[PDB]
């Protein structure tokens, strides 16, 4: 949410397959969910939240 570095709580916003869970089910402020994506897609290249389990 606030930062990409705490993937531990960021993980509750991701399904087991790496697709970011809808914040609607998770709730969270409307603005707060956006911070999740900012920490996830771009920070992907920092390896924060896994793609899925394929490899």
């Amino acid at each position: 949410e606030i930062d990409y570095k705490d993937i531990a709580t960021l993980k509750n916003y991701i399904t087991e397959s790496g697709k970011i869970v809808p914040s609607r089910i998770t709730g969270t402020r409307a603005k707060y969910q956006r911070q999740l994506a900012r920490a996830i897609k771009r920070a992907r290249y920092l390896s924060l939240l896994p793609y899925t389990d394929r490899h």
Partner: protein
Amino acid sequence: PVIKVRENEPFDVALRRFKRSCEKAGVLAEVRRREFYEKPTTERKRAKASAVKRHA
């Protein structure tokens, strides 16, 4: 995605879990959005038409 095999567990018990696992999105249902070609005006009113349907 790994769908692993445990000890002593029948394949029937997970049978419920098998479809529940991907029903959350639906592999082919979202495949339904790459089968053909759609105008974005469709989704926007798709959002519009679906948005109206979403008002109980």
